[PDB]
Design a binder for this molecule. Structure first.
Ligand SMILES: [Mg+2]
Ligand SMILES: [Mg+2]
Ligand SMILES: [Mg+2]
Length: 267
């Protein structure tokens, strides 16, 4: 059976809840750290190896705008760094470099407590807005990553025809900053159909929906990471065919390259 599985069997209820099943502790990153502005590493207290996730905030924002996400995701069994960027005005491709440097810091710069809890073969990135653009760029050039989740992404580039990393893009229907028509949707469509991918558009939502605790983002974010960072097929049933859409849905639409096919071993 899958040795990367962690935590009890998921339900809709457990994934929509404020916290996952794992108590978490934090490590503040040193002042001058190489390649990014600083951050907070959230890690399960329970001594095991977990996947690791770097999360970038957006233009004019700090780690505080994605702090909820780092704690919520860590509590489902992941090591998560929420970064500050060099400056709050850094553009998406700079945020891509800073996400990569944060991954390097978790495996090669953090305490033994942190390094010992990471399976460094199993890594993911996430980001809000320009951080979401950074997620796409880094994914484009690191096909070794297990997952990428751009949240209401902004990037001047719409063409991601090289991305092989399983990618879940969350768009916000009423986004006026990074309209899904100009960013999320063309970016999604350009990703090769051979890539495991999905696009979840939040009904009614604005650009800033990922900057505060959201049950839909939390549920689908966690389930994506479980499915791909942990290869956890207990989570496939939430992703494929995916959430109910329409008028009383929190989801306006959902696209995917479902089904998501598994590999396996015999004991
Ligand atoms: Mg086994
Ligand atoms: Mg709608
Ligand atoms: Mg749409």
């Amino acid at each position: 059976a899958n040795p990367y599985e962690r935590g009890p069997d998921p339900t809709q209820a457990s994934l929509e809840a404020s916290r996952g099943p794992f108590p978490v502790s934090e490590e503040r990153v040193s002042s001058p750290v190489s390649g990014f502005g600083g951050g907070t590493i959230y890690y399960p207290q329970e001594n095991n190896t977990y996947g690791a996730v770097a999360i970038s905030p957006g233009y004019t924002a700090t780690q505080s705008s994605v702090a909820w996400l780092g704690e919520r995701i860590a509590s489902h069994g992941f090591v998560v760094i929420t970064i500050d960027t060099n400056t709050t005005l850094d553009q998406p491709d700079s945020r891509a470099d800073q996400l990569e440097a944060a991954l390097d810091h978790m495996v090669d710069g953090a305490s033994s407590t942190v390094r010992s809890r990471i399976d460094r073969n199993r890594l993911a990135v996430m980001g809000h807005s320009m951080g979401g653009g950074g997620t796409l760029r880094l994914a484009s050039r690191r096909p070794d990553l297990k997952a990428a989740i751009p949240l209401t992404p902004w990037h001047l580039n719409k063409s991601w025809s090289n991305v092989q990393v399983p990618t879940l893009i969350i768009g916000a229907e009423n986004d006026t900053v990074a309209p899904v028509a100009l960013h999320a949707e063309p970016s999604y469509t350009s990703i090769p159909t051979s890539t495991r991918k999905a696009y979840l558009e939040l009904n009614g939502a604005s650009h800033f929906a990922p900057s505060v605790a959201n049950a839909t983002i939390g549920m689908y974010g966690v389930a994506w990471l479980k499915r791909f960072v942990d290869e956890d097929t207990r989570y496939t049933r939430f992703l494929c065919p995916g959430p109910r859409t329409g008028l009383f849905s929190d989801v306006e639409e959902y696209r995917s390259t479902c089904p998501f096919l598994e590999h396996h071993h015999h004991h």
